[PDB]
Design a protein around this ligand. Structure first.
Ligand code: HEC
Ligand code: HEC
Ligand code: HEC
Ligand code: HEC
Ligand code: HEC
Ligand code: HEC
Ligand code: FES
Ligand code: FES
Lengths: 423, 181, 235, 423, 235, 181
């Protein structure tokens, strides 16, 4: 059971004088020969993808910062200095910019893999909490970063996603001014964002430290509602070399596609308007902040008192909870409820591979995510308003009511024993 | 005493910690160079009354647009009913009703109001810049960030934006100038 | 058909004669109003694009406007190390440094320069000081051409730029019919250069990396199939 | 023996559900209730001082970077923007600048405490190695940082301490150009230095992580040549609350003095010439890089073929080893030998409190350090040249020959037993 | 004796009348050649130093040179938000923004302005275009005054600045003998302000922190003496 | 085979890693905007021959100083013996002996050398700027960074600096100009 196999430091004198600093003991006993089940599909790779992508972003950023100058008058020029003069330039920038896209794409699949195979269910709450914390940090990071080029979309995205904090009453304008460094956006905001943007990744790495510490102490989830049967465990092959090699193969494929993009379709995920300098006096059409924030942008700009299911007219009972504040609360709740999940699913069961109704609702949820992604880009004119309202309502409904009802009446399936599934 | 001494040491440590932390949260506030936040003299100077005039100030645009009769009549024909914000956000006067007579502007040092209207070109939803030049579904301004329709006099309509376009404190400089601040 | 360029694909390293033609046009036509500050003059020798003769570059540089200095205010000789000039206002337009990316890009410029036909049969009078373009979409439209809800019934709109070229505005030294269409294509390619000079290096890196990573991935697949063999043989 | 007292997680349900993430187990069992001897004097505090100073510097820097603009044309102006407009300004800058001084002062006492009480002797080699690595990183950091204000001393200090790398043959100019971003100093160097300067502190923290991991696995030295007698250990009180409170008291005193300096004598340790903008065309008199690099500056500019003990005329046997290269090697060796110490002292003994000859030689070494500090500021004219040569020679002599001879014939003392020294 | 200032110590928050006098002196004498770019004009209302009336500040600002713009090249009215002007070359000197720190500082300025006496009895002819100072140390010296190995036998050296003031150059509105010495002291204090405006806040913070930390340290000493009591009582 | 396949996978991984690392070490090299490194026309234009003339170029100063007879005679009276660097660093000619006849400069397009000398104002020790205007113990230049005494013609003396002050490639522009590059 949970064989650590510390190696007893019996190799030789080198492995015996290393009794001063244990380090190799840690690596070997824990982070390399960690028994993992055999039943792992191709959905348990994306964590390696995320770690590599994080390293990539940190490196490329440390390189760019050697040529980026945070200032309204010299940011655009420095970015062009990069893409033209520097030796590698375009590569670093395109790899930095697009890799953010892959990062978020990979976390999406990392998260939805989790919702299916009960990875939030006990005893794996801490991992979930830490993951939501990370998600928040990395969203804030990417936001701070999209601003640095001082293009045109930078300015206005910052403007609105800071007016949010100002929507709330009493302490809105104060926070807004304390965050922007002033009444509106200017170089001060740029300096804050650069610093902050150059600091959070390390916090993320530490949090990834705790993320990795947790699911090593707590066994990796597995396609089944079963554990490694610790009591000797013919199942649960080790990590190295088997799963290391599997993950590296998938990672090679992913990097292949990523570099093909970088080299042929690099400006595809971007907004052309970010290639024109900023004008605080003129706003372009369809700001469309980005593609990894459209869901929450839509959940925000949906509630506007423009439907018979408009709960804003009812929330107006209290004269303080206006629309804006309502949408902001709705977004914060869209995330808080995803974090609260493990204490809402009242099921003494596990992976939805044995819960059909859950399968249907979950695929509807994935569809809802895609729809929200597609709607945040389209105007607030009919019919898109009804669509956004329906989708947000279903998100909240799933995460609040649907899981309890299932946990109550959702066991028409024969659960599998013997995690050694030699089929 | 055990309790008193221990708890007092802890309290003093906490107080010192807070006194050290506060400035790390104070430096991010507006600095003195941002404290200035003063006025601007924009000269109307025959810009062909009726289209628009925009000028930068305080980091935000200040819209100075003449009036087109059709725009005017549409304005003056708006009863307070069915008007989201009837407060006439203009700070050059009290909270008087959001009426075009009060909402257009001072009268050149003369006596007339249905000819000029200078407001803050900042959407009250989240601070975007609406597009002018007769746009939207009300012959006024349209915000492209979320779709808020403004009217001729700038009062909010058809969107999430709660209130109309504010009007800063401004007076005239004897028939060719504007004082913003 | 769509008049695809050379670089439109996995290959097409910027046929350079096209770019020299675009340069002959840009400096003699577009430069009167437009500028390219984000473009050094020393790039007209760097590989990939117009590999002109450096001496001609220094001559053409000294023959341009006067960029004064950064340390001692004094009108210099506009050395190549400096950037192309900037036309800012009073009847002038934006900077074309990266206009090929702020819009499939070059096709916009081609189909824009192409198209300034007379005013249609909805507003033949047109406008004073503004001219009509088939493809610009961010211009004003008269009320006579708008529909019942503000949308325009015209394909394009009214742009503040006049027609840049006539039937035979300039001569090509290489020998080629210098009609409007060829000039438009050439200048579009030149602007795409000014925006993406490191395109060919991009493509070559992409090829090399695709190859090396396919190799690595194949080898890893073999290693995986091997290691996982004694556990996937009876089923 | 080595009582960890994991606490068995018997507190309550909170301390039992924490069996998902061990964290509190780590803290309690190891990093708080770590048995430390009773015989500790006031020299075992400076590590807490260093940790706090590092945190202070990191914080103040993260704040400054919100207003500093890396560029030749806007650095000085941004520094003045800080010292005038910003709310706290002068405080952050003076605390950042001077705290570096305290940092190095504290590491000096941390290191010399070590040389006395045989803390480099076995079984504490890894700590020593890690500490020298750190010292290097933090020297490089402070150097990169003194440059950012783009004053006058910045430029020339950078110039010379980069010409060093160019002294060596074959690969000198290449490295010089690859480090400066060009033939000479300009904005590119500034960007590199800012980035680098804003990144190494985290590496230092990690290295401090390993630094703390090591001497927790290996017992804290103790004033004597004795261990905690693991086999139950009435000696070795715990860390919390006793030594925590002692260290915090000393730290309060140190911060008191430090803030008195900051508020009354802040520009004392600085160079006034760093308040005039840079002129690449004019060099001031007595550049005098700083005060924590004068020892090595002197060891460098001492060997010049100007003494009968001039080994440069002899090293000229090989036509490649000229003077400059010789001084550079001498400096690198001045540090490498301090790192090699634990394998040079051939003594089966410990703290020099029982080795008199070692006491005398060690106090001579401290005097040599002070002298080198005082000499790097004075010209290379007679007599200072002889002084610098003597001092460098003694440094090398100590660390190479003196310790072996002692380890041979240096045991006229009765060693103390019973680390419980109830005298 | 040494004519210590007010701020020379643990107290001395910049007696402001002295600074107003120094300002009368600086704008009417030193400003002809020197500048203080690193100094905003609005600081003449901020506390600590000359708490002048804002309106007078705006007037004095508009009455200065023309600082053109940063966005649209056009000679503006020079609003207070801008910085003091800059005199750069052609018989002009450095910037006095932080000259009180690039040298005990203000005493240098006092004992420098003080001292321009005639040429000594080693080189009475002197030099054409250069004038003599008894305290500047970074100036040239004639060979007649140097020793056998290049060192100068004079106290100071020859500075390119002429004598700035005579016996009664300007009047003080408050009523005070405006001799050279008082003006020198006043202008020295003004420059020290221009360099260290946040001095008094520095001192007050230092006091507060010394107090709080002494308190904390005393309490920790008591706690230590207590905890370590049962182990240090028999000896 | 076990050995071949495993080792080959490792080799390919290593190769890819290196191909990815190299640019992270290449970007820090001089960029194309630093590649330029071209020439400058400084006009002597009667600057009162005998004191000095300094101009910025390539990021370093280029010293153009006329000659003072006493400085000259001290120069021409220096035998190659007791001269640290006798190579005449000047790159406008071969490694000819560091003699004042070759070491002063071209002759205005005429025939004379003991009147002008333009060298690179960069100490060969570590790149500091020596102080001019007759300084040091040899009537020339003195480096304040470590104490290196230069002579009248710029040849190193009395210090760690190994070689004299180099002389860039320069020719005259017909009696009032200098071409640096
Ligand atoms: C002045 C006589 C011009 C010359 C000659 C050329 N251009 Fe221009 N251009 C000019 C103006 C005033 C404008 C702004 C138009 C507006 O309505 O805002 C432009 C614009 C362009 C654009 C941008 C179009 C867009 O979608 O915003 C392009 C791509 C452009 N012009 C191209 C172009 C070329 C290739 C020229 C030389 C052949 C050229 N222009 C000449 C003014 C003038
Ligand atoms: C031109 C007529 C001047 C006026 C009036 C004032 N100053 Fe000046 N100053 C001037 C020059 C050309 C120089 C450079 C001198 C040199 O030899 O390099 C200076 C220098 C100073 C300095 C710096 C001295 C030093 O040690 O470097 C100071 C502190 C100074 N001057 C003060 C000063 C004051 C207070 C003035 C008004 C009372 C003033 N100067 C007027 C030119 C001129
Ligand atoms: C060491 C510095 C650094 C780190 C670490 C870093 N970046 Fe950046 N980032 C930059 C710089 C510099 C820019 C501006 C240059 C650019 O846009 O490429 C930038 C810009 C961006 C942009 C906008 C790209 C563009 O071209 O508009 C995004 C998105 C972004 N960062 C996201 C991230 C995310 C997400 C992470 C990690 C979680 C990250 N970055 C890590 C330095 C860094
Ligand atoms: C909001 C949720 C969430 C986020 C965001 C998240 N994780 Fe996870 N992670 C999980 C859960 C749940 C598991 C499953 C743990 C288990 O099975 O015991 C997991 C497992 C892992 C694993 C091991 C198994 C696997 O799925 O590969 C790795 C490695 C990993 N995460 C890395 C990362 C990294 C690196 C990041 C970010 C840079 C990240 N994760 C972001 C929740 C998250
Ligand atoms: C988050 C950024 C950051 C960190 C971390 C940081 N500093 Fe700095 N440092 C700066 C900035 C910004 C400046 C320039 C402003 C200044 O000089 O105060 C600077 C300047 C300096 C200076 C010159 C001070 C002056 O005023 O001339 C020194 C010395 C220095 N740093 C040393 C250090 C050392 C040693 C460390 C930690 C081991 C450190 N710094 C940590 C940001 C930082
Ligand atoms: C070059 C040597 C060196 C450097 C530099 C160094 N250390 Fe140490 N450190 C030591 C040695 C040796 C010990 C003694 C360990 C023992 O007694 O087991 C020690 C002990 C410590 C201790 C515990 C006992 C004590 O002396 O306080 C702490 C805490 C500590 N170091 C922190 C730090 C921090 C934080 C830094 C830098 C930011 C640092 N040290 C730099 C070598 C070094
Ligand atoms: S920001 Fe103006 S409507 Fe949303
Ligand atoms: S740098 Fe010129 S002598 Fe040391």
């Amino acid at each position: 059971s949970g064989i650590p196999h510390d190696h007893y430091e019996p190799k030789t004198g080198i492995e015996k004088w290393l009794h001063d600093r244990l380090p190799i003991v840690g690596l070997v006993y824990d982070t390399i020969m960690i028994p993992t089940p055999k039943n792992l599909n191709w959905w348990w790779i994306w964590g390696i993808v995320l770690a590599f992508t994080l390293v990539l972003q940190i490196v490329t950023g440390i390189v760019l910062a050697m040529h980026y100058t945070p200032h309204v008058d010299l940011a655009f020029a420095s970015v062009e200095h990069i893409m033209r003069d520097v030796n590698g330039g375009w590569a670093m920038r395109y790899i930095h910019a697009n890799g953010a896209s892959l990062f978020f794409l990979a976390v999406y699949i990392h998260i939805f893999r989790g919702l299916y195979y009960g990875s939030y269910k006990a005893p794996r709450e801490i991992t979930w909490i830490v993951g939501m914390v990370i998600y928040l940090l990395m969203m804030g990071t990417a936001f701070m970063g999209y601003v640095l080029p001082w293009g045109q979309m930078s300015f206005w995205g910052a403007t609105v996603i800071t007016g949010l904090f100002g929507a709330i009453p009493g302490i809105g304008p104060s926070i807004q001014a304390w965050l922007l460094g002033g009444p509106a956006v200017d170089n001060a905001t740029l300096n804050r964002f650069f610093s902050l943007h150059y600091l959070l990744p390390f916090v993320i790495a530490a949090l990834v430290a705790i993320h990795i510490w947790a699911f090593h102490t707590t066994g990796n989830n597995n396609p089944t509602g079963v554990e490694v049967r610790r009591t000797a465990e013919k199942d649960t092959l080790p990590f190295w070399p088997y799963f290391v090699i599997k993950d590296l193969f998938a990672l090679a494929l992913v990097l292949l596609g990523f570099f093909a993009v970088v080299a042929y379709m690099p400006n595809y995920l971007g907004h052309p308007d970010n290639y024109v300098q900023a004008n605080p006096l003129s706003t372009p059409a369809h700001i469309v902040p980005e593609w990894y924030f459209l869901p929450f942008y839509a959940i925000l700009r949906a509630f506007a008192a423009d439907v018979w299911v408009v709960i804003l007219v009812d929330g107006l009972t209290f004269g303080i909870v206006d629309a804006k504040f309502f949408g902001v609360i709705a977004m914060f709740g869209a995330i808080a409820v995803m974090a609260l999940a493990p204490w809402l699913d009242t099921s003494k069961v596990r992976s939805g591979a044995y819960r059909p109704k859950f399968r249907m609702w979950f695929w509807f949820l994935v569809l809802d995510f895609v729809v929200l992604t597609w709607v945040g880009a389209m105007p607030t004119e009919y019919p898109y308003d009804w669509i956004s309202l329906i989708a947000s309502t279903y998100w909240f409904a799933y995460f609040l009511v649907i899981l309890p009802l299932l946990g109550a009446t959702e066991k028409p399936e024969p659960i599998p024993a013997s995690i050694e599934e030699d089929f | 005493r055990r309790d008193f001494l221990y708890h007092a040491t802890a309290a003093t440590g906490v107080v010192v910690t807070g006194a050290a932390v506060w400035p790390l949260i104070n430096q991010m506030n507006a600095s003195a160079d941002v404290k200035a936040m003063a006025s601007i003299f924009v000269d109307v100077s025959a810009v062909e009354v009726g289209t628009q005039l925009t000028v930068k100030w305080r980091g935000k645009p200040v819209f100075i647009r003449r009036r087109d009769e059709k725009d005017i009549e549409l304005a003056r024909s708006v009863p307070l009913g069915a008007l989201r914000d009837t407060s006439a956000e203009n700070a050059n006067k009290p909270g008087a009703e959001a009426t075009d007579e009060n909402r257009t502007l001072p009268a050149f040092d003369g006596t007339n109001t249905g000819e000029w209207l200078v407001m803050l070109g900042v959407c009250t939803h989240l601070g975007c810049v609406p597009m002018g030049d007769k746009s939207g579904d009300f012959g006024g301004w349209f915000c492209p960030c979320h779709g808020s329709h403004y009217d001729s006099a700038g009062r909010i309509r058809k969107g999430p934006a709660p209130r109309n376009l504010d009007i800063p404190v401004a007076a005239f400089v004897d028939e060719t100038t504007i004082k913003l601040g | 058909p769509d008049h695809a360029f050379s670089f439109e694909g996995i290959f097409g390293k910027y046929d350079q004669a096209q770019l020299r033609r675009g340069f002959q046009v840009y400096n003699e036509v577009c430069s009167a109003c437009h500028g390219m500050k984000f473009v050094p003059i020393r790039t007209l020798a760097d590989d990939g694009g117009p590999q002109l003769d450096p001496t001609f570059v220094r001559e053409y540089a000294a023959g341009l406007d006067t960029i004064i200095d950064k340390d001692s205010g004094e009108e210099r000789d506009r050395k190549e190390t400096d950037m192309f000039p900037t036309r800012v206002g009073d009847g002038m337009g934006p900077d074309l440094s990266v206009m090929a990316k702020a819009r499939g890009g070059p096709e916009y410029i081609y189909n824009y320069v192409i198209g300034f036909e007379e005013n249609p049969e909805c507003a033949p009078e047109g406008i004073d000081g503004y001219y009509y373009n088939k493809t610009f979409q961010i211009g004003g439209v008269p009320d006579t051409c708008k529909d019942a809800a503000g949308v325009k019934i015209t394909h394009g709109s009214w742009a503040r730029m006049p027609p840049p070229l006539v039937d035979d505005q300039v001569t090509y030294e290489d020998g080629t019919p210098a009609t409007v269409d060829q000039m438009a294509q050439d200048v579009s390619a030149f602007l795409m250069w000014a925006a993406e000079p490191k395109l060919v290096a991009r493509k070559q890196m992409g090829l090399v990396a695709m190859v090396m990573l396919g190799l690595l991935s194949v080898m890893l697949y073999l290693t995986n199939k091997r290691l996982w063999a004694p556990y996937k043989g009876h089923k």
